[PDB]
């Protein structure tokens, strides 16, 4: 029973990795985020992953306003623990924050087991984007302080 579910999960991972490879990034996944200057690759990666997740649970809508801009925050203060990715509002225009130091700490933490390590990093990044899209879904529908509340508690989605 669970075997078919596991196959489907690994298939979702295969789509994830293949989509990332379609961005023509020969650099290792870790070294991509090591480059603080290569913000464009990070931003495009994140937007593509968000659109894919939205598509997976909402296949109807295919295109989204990517006008949201991505700034890689590197100040410890500006960083918000728990949510390395944040979406603000600037007079109707939403931005994005990226804690590259937190990402690097995430990528080099542990190697598990006892190639596949790529898969571990890929799954980690996917879950990061999972949080990102969950709270952004909250805002995109209705967020002013309810989005702030959802930041204070990401479990309101539960399922």
């Amino acid at each position: 029973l669970e075997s078919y579910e596991t196959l489907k999960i690994k298939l979702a991972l295969s789509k994830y990795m293949a989509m990332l490879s379609t961005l023509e990034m020969t650099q290792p996944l870790l070294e991509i985020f090591r480059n603080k200057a290569d913000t464009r690759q990070i931003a495009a990666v994140v937007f593509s992953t968000l659109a894919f997740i939205h598509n997976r649970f909402h296949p109807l809508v295919t295109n989204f306003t990517n006008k949201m801009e991505f700034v890689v925050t590197e100040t410890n203060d500006t960083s918000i623990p728990g949510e390395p990715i944040l979406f603000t509002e600037n007079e109707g225009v939403l931005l994005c924050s990226v804690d590259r130091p937190s990402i690097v700490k995430m990528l080099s933490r542990e190697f598990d087991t006892e190639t596949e390590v790529e898969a571990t990093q890929y799954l980690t990044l996917l879950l990061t984007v999972e949080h990102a899209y969950l709270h952004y879904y909250i805002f995109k529908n209705y967020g002013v302080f309810e989005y702030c509340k959802s930041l204070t508690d990401h479990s309101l989605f539960t399922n």
Binding site: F57, Y142, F145, S150, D153, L156, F157, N159
Partner: protein, 316 residues
């Protein structure tokens, strides 16, 4: 009479999808300095004053909307407001504690104090905005016999299908709490409904004795279901020779907010007696079924079709 009403919307509201009913437009003094931006939708009676229309038009910080209400029905209010503002989901409505309007449709409907709204949460165990539906016990899904019987085995499939859609499943009856709970255990409806209520005729037309602040619920944890007690007596709406089965929207809204439910797309009433349909948006006149008939397909498809009509009417 075709009651004219004026509705206003704030372009930069602090919080979205909420309603505030005022006696007149000039009631902004009650909200006062910068405390009116909390709410989104403002509605009030129109006194057939073109000068007042000019006064409203002077307000460049809001939107203008004037319509007609042939009857003082909450349904018509919701329909017209949503159609004018194109919003697919309707939020909560608020009134002033000191100066609450005495409109007839407000009676038997839940009213939120204006200030208390800011201390709520959006958690509803839902992907997005769900619907609301409640079902009758006798002659609807449970045989009147001692041994409770399912009207249609497809009812359980329908319940999980609605769960796929996300509609909120509610049970409200009038029989004994213990008997109905044991009936749910016998039919194995634990993992389907969200709120379980019975004995809805608690109204005694209370007018004096100043009895309040007395809550005591014996939640038998044999099933851990919420065996809450209906501490409400609000059947005083209009004079009539005989009144019963109040089945008011107010109680349903209260128990919904118990789970932080504050943004429902639509609500439907599923019961046999039309008397329970006072101002419910959708009423399903279920045929009396004291014995199994297993014809739930037609009613289930009717539910789906009503939902589709709602969505197409307002979203499109």
């Amino acid at each position: 009479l075709q009651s004219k009403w004026i509705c206003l919307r704030l372009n930069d509201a602090i919080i979205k999808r909420h309603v505030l009913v005022l006696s007149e437009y000039a009631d902004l003094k009650y909200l006062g300095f910068e405390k009116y931006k909390f709410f989104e939708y403002v509605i009030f009676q129109f006194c057939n004053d073109p000068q007042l229309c000019k006064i409203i038009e002077n307000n460049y910080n809001y939107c203008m909307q004037i319509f007609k209400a042939p009857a003082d029905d909450m349904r018509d209010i919701r329909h017209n407001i949503k159609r004018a503002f194109k919003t697919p989901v309707l939020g909560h409505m608020c009134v002033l504690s000191n100066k609450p309007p005495m409109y007839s449709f407000l009676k038997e409907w839940f009213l939120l104090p204006h200030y208390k709204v800011v201390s709520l949460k959006s958690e509803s165990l839902t992907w997005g905005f769900p619907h609301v539906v409640v079902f009758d016990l006798d002659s609807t899904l449970i045989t009147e016999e001692e041994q409770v019987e399912i009207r249609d085995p497809f009812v359980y499939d329908s319940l999980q299908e609605l769960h796929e859609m996300g509609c909120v499943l509610v049970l409200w009856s009038y029989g004994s709490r213990d008997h109905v709970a044991h009936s749910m255990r016998d039919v194995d409806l634990e993992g389907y409904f969200d709120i379980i209520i019975s004995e809805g005729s608690t109204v005694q037309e209370e007018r004096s004795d100043l009895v309040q602040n007395s809550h005591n619920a014996i939640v038998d944890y044999n099933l851990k279901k919420r065996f809450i007690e209906n501490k409400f007596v609000f059947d005083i709406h209009n004079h009539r020779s005989d009144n019963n089965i109040p089945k008011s929207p107010k109680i349903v809204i209260k128990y919904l907010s118990d789970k932080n439910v504050n943004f429902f797309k639509s609500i439907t009433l599923v019961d046999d007696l039309p008397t329970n349909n006072y101002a419910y948006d959708f009423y399903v006149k279920v045929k009396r079924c004291p014995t199994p008939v297993q014809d739930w397909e037609h009613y289930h498809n009717e539910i789906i079709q009503n939902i589709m009509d709602y969505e197409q009417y307002f979203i499109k």
